[PDB]
Design a protein around this ligand. Sequence first.
Ligand SMILES: [Cl-]
Lengths: 192, 193
Amino acid sequence: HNYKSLKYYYSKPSIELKNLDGLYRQKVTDKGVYVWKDRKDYFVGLLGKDIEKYPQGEHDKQDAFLVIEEETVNGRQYSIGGLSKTNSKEFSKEVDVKVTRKIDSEKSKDSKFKITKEEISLKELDFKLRKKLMEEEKLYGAVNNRKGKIVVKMEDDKFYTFELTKKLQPHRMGDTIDGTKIKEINVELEYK
Amino acid sequence: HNYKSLKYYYSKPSIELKNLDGLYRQKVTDKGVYVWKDRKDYFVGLLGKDIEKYPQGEHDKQDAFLVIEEETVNGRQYSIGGLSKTNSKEFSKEVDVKVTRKIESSEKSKDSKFKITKEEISLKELDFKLRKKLMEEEKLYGAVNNRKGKIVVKMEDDKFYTFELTKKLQPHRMGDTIDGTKIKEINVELEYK
Ligand SMILES: [Cl-]
């Protein structure tokens, strides 16, 4: 069912690897990179426009946000996208999280969310915000708790949306945005 | 570099499995299905909307268009998308292929035929078979500059599907399918001499 796949995907643990010891694109014909830190290696899938940023060879000063998928790829644990430029300097910013709840009228309450990367993947935003919602707003706690959306709003009013009724598309996991320009996060939940 | 990867990728052999002996989705949490025919197994990734067509369990009356990627997945040869419902009966259709050359003005065109064997066909197959025709008949990826242009699959209702030749077909599109009986014409534009 749609519920089980959401619940058991977003309940998975995540690994934040800041400053990889390395990430390596072996072949121009493959769809991923070998990444490693502290003697732990993984294979990361490049299934969107992110493949264009990592040509054959090595690339340094990079971060990785991992969610270990069910597939074993090239003998390693696998994750899709979540790659980004490592911070140039220390950066930490708390943004407001407006959680509105349509029932039919509505109920809302504010919370905060800690941003720590200058350049951040949609994968990370998506996964961490859903986890926050699973823990605090009963997201995917019952078959009926799956409708709504997460909106990440920028200072120039551009925004990014995550539909809660389905998993973030793999081709969007490698997309990144300027963490320093995230203005606010608006969440709408359409369940009791 | 990009040119090299296009040549390499579209030079790969394809594998057409009509009426799979099996297609099994192991977990609702995974991103693919095990497929097999005539004692040969493979794992096919579901990285687009195609994932919604194969819930946990087994499925039959399916076809698979394979292109083996560099990645080994679950200890098997891996391909992305290319799944479709098998033909309900014998089906064939000859469709025109118009090839022009823009060098911004498209010159004289050469017309050829392309046979459609399936009722429901994946964008992966159309894309891969059509580029292989071009590599063989129009020097596609035969040199550094033979990579610009586009393949356009037009339907009866004027709606169309486009493949940019300067890059590989996006993985999230490989599993999308269209009605093979509704395919009207194939218009190709090559931006090189
Ligand atoms: Cl493997």
